[PDB]
Amino acid sequence: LPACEAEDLATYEQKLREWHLERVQLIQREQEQREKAKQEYQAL
RNA sequence: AACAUAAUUAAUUUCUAGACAUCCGUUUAUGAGAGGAGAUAAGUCGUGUAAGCAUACUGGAAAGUGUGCUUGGAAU
Numbered sequence: 743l744p745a746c747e748a749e750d751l752a753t754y755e756q757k758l759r760e761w762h763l764e765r766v767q768l769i770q771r772e773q774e775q776r777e778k779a780k781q782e783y784q785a786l
Numbered sequence: 787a788a789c790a791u792a793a794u795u796a797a798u799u800u801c802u803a804g805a806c807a808u809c810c811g812u813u814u815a816u817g818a819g820a821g822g823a824g825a826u827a828a829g830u831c832g833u834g835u836a837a838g839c840a841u842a843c844u845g846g847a848a849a850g851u852g853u854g855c856u857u858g859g860a861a862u
């Protein structure tokens with residue numbers, strides 16, 4: 743088990759960074775569509 | 787009236803709601819009233835100024851008279 747803890751914790755750190763990047767992408771995509779929504783209402 | 791949500795399988799919602807309330811007008815019939823043309827059939831008094839056509843007037847209303855036309859009258 744001691745050896746597994748080191749490996750799992752290394753993968754855990756990688757997952758946190760992968761999750762952080764994916765979350766940022768979702769936040770950015772949300773901002774873009776909302777900005778487009780304003781343009782749609784301006785056109786409408 | 788018809789947007790937007792979403793989106794590291796992809797889908798959801800939208801994809802409306804008002805207004806016909808009812809005409810103006812239109813056809814069929816009940817039909818007061820008044821005639822017309824028939825049916826049943828005996829009455830009624832009348833009925834020789836050639837006839838008819840069109841038209842006018844007069845006839846209690848078949849007719850008479852005027853005007854033109856016709857022979858589907860007569861005429862050596």
Ligand SMILES: [Mg+2]
Nearest residue numbers: 838839840841
């Ligand atoms: Mg006459």
